[PDB]
């Protein structure tokens, strides 16, 4: 590139990798979102919560692609693997899957930041600090809170608690 300056080929490759991980995360949330809209699951606030995450992950990979072009790297795309489950169980099972996905993304971001640090790329380090690291921390905190309220609502009266959590914590209608 006539513009490329201080941008390691290893960072360029790891940015492409992280774009595939966001594409795959977005597709997982797509599937979670539709699953909760099934007539035999029918938790619209849960569905909305995951659809909005599919959108947020989408903005993540678009931001990464834009930055790849601003630095003079070249986007390379790979096949996007289907989500790990076809059916996602009850609200607490889905939320625990989402939390494990966000931990995996957060560790990928932290590995990419360590890589950019090792290549002394402060533009890369600040881009991740600014647009990604704090957003992940807030989201994981929010999922932890939701798992804790789902657990206080669980036990023998679990169907009732699931109905209440969807109605009084999550956003709907």
Annotated binding residue at 166?
no
Interface of this chain with a copy of itself, residues 89 to 118, rule: CB under 8 A: 99, 103, 106-107, 110, 113-114, 117
Taking CB under 8 A as the rule, does residue 8 contact a copy of itself?
no
Contact partner, 135, from a copy of itself, Fe ion, ligand PER, none, Cβ < 5-8 Å per class:
none
- For a copy of itself, the closer CB: 38 or 93: 38
Outline where the chain has alpha helix (H): 9-37, 44-71, 91-118, 122-128, 134-152, 158-168
Contact partner, 119, from ligand PER, a copy of itself, Fe ion, none, Cβ < 5-8 Å per class:
none
CB under 5 A: which stretch of 31-39, 58-66, 109-117, 130-138 binds Fe ion?
A: 58-66
CA distance 67 to 127: 8
- For a copy of itself, the closer CB: 10 or 100: 100
Return the closest-CA partner of residue 58 out of 13, 111, 22: 22
Say how far residue 5 (Cα) sits from the centre of its chain: 30
CA distance 14 to 148: 34
Please tell me the number of Cα atoms within 13 Å of 43 on its side-chain side.
27
Residues 6+ apart with CB under 8 A from 29: 50, 51, 53, 54, 57, 98
Q: Considering the complex, what minimum distance in angstroms separates the CB of residue 55 from Fe ion? A: 5
Binding-site member from 10, 59, 129, 157 for ligand PER (CB under 6 A): 59
Please give the residue ranges that form the binding site for ligand PER (CB under 6 A).
55-56, 59
């Amino acid at each position: 590139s006539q513009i490329r300056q201080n941008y390691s080929t290893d960072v360029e490759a790891a940015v492409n990798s992280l774009v595939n991980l966001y594409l795959q995360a977005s597709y997982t949330y797509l599937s979670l979102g539709f699953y909760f809209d099934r007539d035999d699951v029918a938790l619209e606030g849960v569905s909305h919560f995951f659809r909005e995450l599919a959108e947020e992950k989408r903005e993540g990979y678009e931001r990464l692609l834009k930055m790849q072009n601003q630095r003079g790297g070249r986007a390379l795309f790979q096949d996007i693997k289907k989500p790990a489950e076809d059916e996602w169980g009850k609200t607490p099972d889905a939320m625990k899957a989402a939390m494990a996905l966000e931990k995996k993304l957060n560790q990928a971001l932290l590995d990419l930041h360590a890589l950019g640090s090792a290549r002394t790329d402060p533009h890369l380090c600040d881009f991740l600090e600014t647009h990604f690291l704090d957003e992940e921390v807030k989201l994981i905190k929010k999922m932890g809170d939701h798992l804790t309220n789902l657990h206080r609502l669980g036990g023998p009266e679990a169907g009732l608690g699931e109905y209440l959590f969807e109605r009084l914590t999550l956003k709907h209608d």
